[PDB]
Design a protein around this ligand. Structure first.
Ligand SMILES: CCCCCCCCCCCCCCCC(=O)N[C@H](CSC[C@H](COC(=O)CCCCCCCCCCCCCCC)OC(=O)CCCCCCCCCCCCCCC)C(N)=O
Length: 188
């Protein structure tokens, strides 16, 4: 079925580097943003996403901490990865328990798959992925409630082209750090 076919394809890949092009389209049909950069990924939950143009930004997951680094304003935020990837198909990679796949209705047209959550209250209501029978990922998208779609076209996929340093982040000299992992709050 679509689910088994999609899992069988993604199962072929463990790590890669790829370059990406991003297109954000609003439901109006206007492409409201375009960008490019590099992605390194390593199972189960490690990634380094670096948007180089137009507005530089770095997301690094060591599998527990997600760092967001804006080099333009020299600000880095440390968050828990689990707080950013919840209610997405991230768990299909990071955990890959059979019942995780059962959260989504998955439909196939060739190398194109569409994942629709069955019982989510989240903002993301659709995912798409184009992945060849060899596990090469060509495209991915996510759709928000207002129909804003964030789409990624991957090129130059190279499996195994990652080192462990890509998945570690130490704030550079002079970078302001907001560590949201660590003043207690009074409530009515
Ligand atoms: C499909 C089958 C299973 C694959 C599942 C992958 C799920 C990816 C979700 C990533 C979580 C988002 C973290 C950003 C925080 C955020 O800002 N949240 C919300 C965002 S709301 C709007 C939108 C929504 O965000 C996105 O969907 C980003 C998509 C970009 C990734 C495209 C490459 C595809 C790679 C798939 C690889 C499979 C692995 C194969 C084997 C290794 O935001 C954006 O597009 C901008 C943010 C881009 C930053 C993405 C970098 C994460 C790449 C993670 C890929 C690693 C996958 C597993 C690791 C082994 C918010 N702002 O509230």
């Amino acid at each position: 079925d679509a689910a088994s076919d999609l899992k069988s394809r993604l199962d072929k890949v463990s790590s890669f580097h790829a370059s990406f092009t991003q297109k954000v389209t609003d439901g109006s049909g206007a492409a409201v943003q375009e960008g490019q950069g590099d992605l390194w990924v390593k199972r189960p939950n490690l990634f380094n996403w670096h948007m180089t143009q137009p507005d530089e930004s770095i997301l690094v997951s060591d599998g527990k901490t997600l760092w967001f680094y804006n080099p333009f304003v020299e600000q880095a935020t440390a968050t828990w990865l689990k707080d950013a990837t919840g209610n997405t198909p991230f768990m299909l990679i990071a955990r890959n328990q059979s019942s995780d796949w059962q959260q989504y209705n998955i439909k196939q047209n060739g190398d194109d798959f569409v994942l629709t959550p069955k019982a989510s209250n989240g903002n993301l209501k659709q995912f798409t992925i184009n992945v060849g029978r060899d596990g090469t990922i060509h495209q991915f998208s996510a759709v928000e409630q207002d129909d804003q779609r964030s789409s990624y076209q991957l090129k130059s996929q190279q499996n195994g082209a990652v080192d462990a340093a890509k998945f570690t982040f130490t704030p550079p000299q002079g970078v302001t750090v907001d560590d949201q992992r660590k003043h207690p709050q009074f409530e009515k």
